[PDB]
Design a protein around this motif. Structure first.
Motif, PDB file in Angstrom:
ATOM      1  N   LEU A  76     -12.332  -4.201   9.111  1.00  0.00           N
ATOM      2  CA  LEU A  76     -11.467  -4.871   8.185  1.00  0.00           C
ATOM      3  C   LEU A  76     -10.405  -3.861   7.747  1.00  0.00           C
ATOM      4  O   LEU A  76     -10.734  -2.813   7.147  1.00  0.00           O
ATOM      5  N   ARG A  77      -9.172  -4.130   8.168  1.00  0.00           N
ATOM      6  CA  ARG A  77      -8.018  -3.268   7.951  1.00  0.00           C
ATOM      7  C   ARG A  77      -7.104  -3.954   6.957  1.00  0.00           C
ATOM      8  O   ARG A  77      -6.305  -4.853   7.311  1.00  0.00           O
ATOM      9  N   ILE A  78      -7.304  -3.577   5.699  1.00  0.00           N
ATOM     10  CA  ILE A  78      -6.615  -4.223   4.612  1.00  0.00           C
ATOM     11  C   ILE A  78      -5.229  -3.668   4.344  1.00  0.00           C
ATOM     12  O   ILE A  78      -4.983  -2.457   4.295  1.00  0.00           O
ATOM     13  N   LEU A  79      -4.287  -4.593   4.194  1.00  0.00           N
ATOM     14  CA  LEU A  79      -2.897  -4.280   4.003  1.00  0.00           C
ATOM     15  C   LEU A  79      -2.458  -4.613   2.568  1.00  0.00           C
ATOM     16  O   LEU A  79      -3.153  -5.336   1.859  1.00  0.00           O
ATOM     17  N   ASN A  80      -1.304  -4.086   2.142  1.00  0.00           N
ATOM     18  CA  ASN A  80      -0.695  -4.471   0.869  1.00  0.00           C
ATOM     19  C   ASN A  80       0.809  -4.791   1.019  1.00  0.00           C
ATOM     20  O   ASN A  80       1.589  -4.687   0.068  1.00  0.00           O
ATOM     21  N   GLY A  86       5.907  -2.479  -3.066  1.00  0.00           N
ATOM     22  CA  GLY A  86       5.374  -1.895  -4.293  1.00  0.00           C
ATOM     23  C   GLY A  86       3.982  -1.370  -3.998  1.00  0.00           C
ATOM     24  O   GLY A  86       3.375  -1.730  -2.985  1.00  0.00           O
ATOM     25  N   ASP A  87       3.503  -0.466  -4.836  1.00  0.00           N
ATOM     26  CA  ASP A  87       2.202   0.100  -4.638  1.00  0.00           C
ATOM     27  C   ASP A  87       1.184  -0.326  -5.694  1.00  0.00           C
ATOM     28  O   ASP A  87       0.136   0.261  -5.765  1.00  0.00           O
ATOM     29  N   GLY A  95      -7.183  -5.370  -3.321  1.00  0.00           N
ATOM     30  CA  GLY A  95      -7.631  -4.579  -2.192  1.00  0.00           C
ATOM     31  C   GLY A  95      -8.327  -3.318  -2.653  1.00  0.00           C
ATOM     32  O   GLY A  95      -9.372  -2.953  -2.127  1.00  0.00           O
ATOM     33  N   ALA A  96      -7.801  -2.673  -3.682  1.00  0.00           N
ATOM     34  CA  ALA A  96      -8.436  -1.453  -4.165  1.00  0.00           C
ATOM     35  C   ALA A  96      -9.744  -1.743  -4.945  1.00  0.00           C
ATOM     36  O   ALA A  96     -10.675  -0.933  -4.898  1.00  0.00           O
ATOM     37  N   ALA A  97      -9.835  -2.896  -5.613  1.00  0.00           N
ATOM     38  CA  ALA A  97     -11.091  -3.323  -6.277  1.00  0.00           C
ATOM     39  C   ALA A  97     -12.194  -3.563  -5.234  1.00  0.00           C
ATOM     40  O   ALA A  97     -13.297  -3.039  -5.338  1.00  0.00           O
ATOM     41  N   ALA A  98     -11.839  -4.250  -4.165  1.00  0.00           N
ATOM     42  CA  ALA A  98     -12.762  -4.540  -3.091  1.00  0.00           C
ATOM     43  C   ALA A  98     -13.171  -3.245  -2.399  1.00  0.00           C
ATOM     44  O   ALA A  98     -14.356  -3.093  -2.069  1.00  0.00           O
ATOM     45  N   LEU A  99     -12.214  -2.337  -2.168  1.00  0.00           N
ATOM     46  CA  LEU A  99     -12.554  -1.008  -1.614  1.00  0.00           C
ATOM     47  C   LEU A  99     -13.544  -0.237  -2.441  1.00  0.00           C
ATOM     48  O   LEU A  99     -14.481   0.344  -1.868  1.00  0.00           O
ATOM     49  N   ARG A 160      -4.095   2.670  -0.912  1.00  0.00           N
ATOM     50  CA  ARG A 160      -2.689   2.781  -0.457  1.00  0.00           C
ATOM     51  C   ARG A 160      -2.579   3.611   0.820  1.00  0.00           C
ATOM     52  O   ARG A 160      -1.827   3.271   1.711  1.00  0.00           O
ATOM     53  N   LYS A 161      -3.295   4.734   0.894  1.00  0.00           N
ATOM     54  CA  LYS A 161      -3.293   5.545   2.120  1.00  0.00           C
ATOM     55  C   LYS A 161      -3.822   4.736   3.302  1.00  0.00           C
ATOM     56  O   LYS A 161      -3.227   4.760   4.420  1.00  0.00           O
TER      57      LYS A 161
END
Length: 202
Positions: A76-80, A86-87, A95-99, A160-161
């Protein structure tokens, strides 16, 4: 202080028997004893993408079965990209909560948390902040450690990275950044995307 629902609220929670890892910018879902010849999937999605939610409704179920069978390993390759350069918009917050949940290794919470964020995307989008994502994670079973990390945006920098690496990989393998996208062993599924899991399992 409570931000979403209340401290008694129970959410529906599907049982899953797979495990996972966070490797090479992907959240990897795999059986404990996955076959060494399982097909490697690169599945690109964004938590603000309506067609990612729509595809998930169709293919999450069969995907789970194929993963639990040891037939595919899903990266699973999550994008934003939907945050429009924006970051810290909804795609990053979700995405960062799920990460943060995946990083903890609680795969049953992760799976159900992902499903919820996609299912409710239209109600969440622009309305939830970090404390909302955190409350919901906790309610679904995330640890106190994970929950506080979400409140503080602790996994955002790495998210983000990962998101940047994944969009560069998608550009390289697939020309342009959009979602959902699925590849089976490096080969993009362009046609009959609704049946990608069948295609992957032959």
């Amino acid at each position: 202080k409570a931000h979403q629902a209340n401290k008694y609220a129970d959410y529906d929670k599907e049982s899953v028997s797979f495990t996972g890892s966070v490797t090479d910018s992907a959240i990897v879902l795999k059986a404990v004893n996955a076959k060494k010849d399982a097909k490697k999937i690169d599945f690109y999605e964004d938590f603000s993408c309506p067609h990612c939610a729509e595809l998930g409704e169709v293919t999450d179920g069969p995907m789970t079965k194929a993963i639990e069978n040891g037939d595919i390993v899903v990266n699973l390759r999550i994008l934003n990209f939907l945050d429009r350069d924006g970051d810290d918009g909804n795609s990053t917050k979700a995405g960062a909560a799920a990460l943060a949940v995946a990083q903890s290794g609680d795969w049953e919470t992760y799976w159900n948390y992902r499903a919820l964020l996609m299912k409710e995307q239209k109600n969440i989008y622009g309305k939830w902040g970090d404390n909302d994502f955190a409350d919901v994670a906790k309610s679904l079973g995330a640890s106190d450690e994970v929950t506080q990390k979400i409140r503080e945006g602790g996994a955002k920098e790495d998210f983000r990275k990962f998101a940047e690496a994944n969009s560069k990989k998608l550009e390289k393998d697939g020309g342009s950044v959009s979602s959902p996208r699925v590849f089976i062993d490096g080969k993009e599924v362009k046609n009959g995307i609704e049946t990608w899991v069948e295609q992957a399992t032959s």
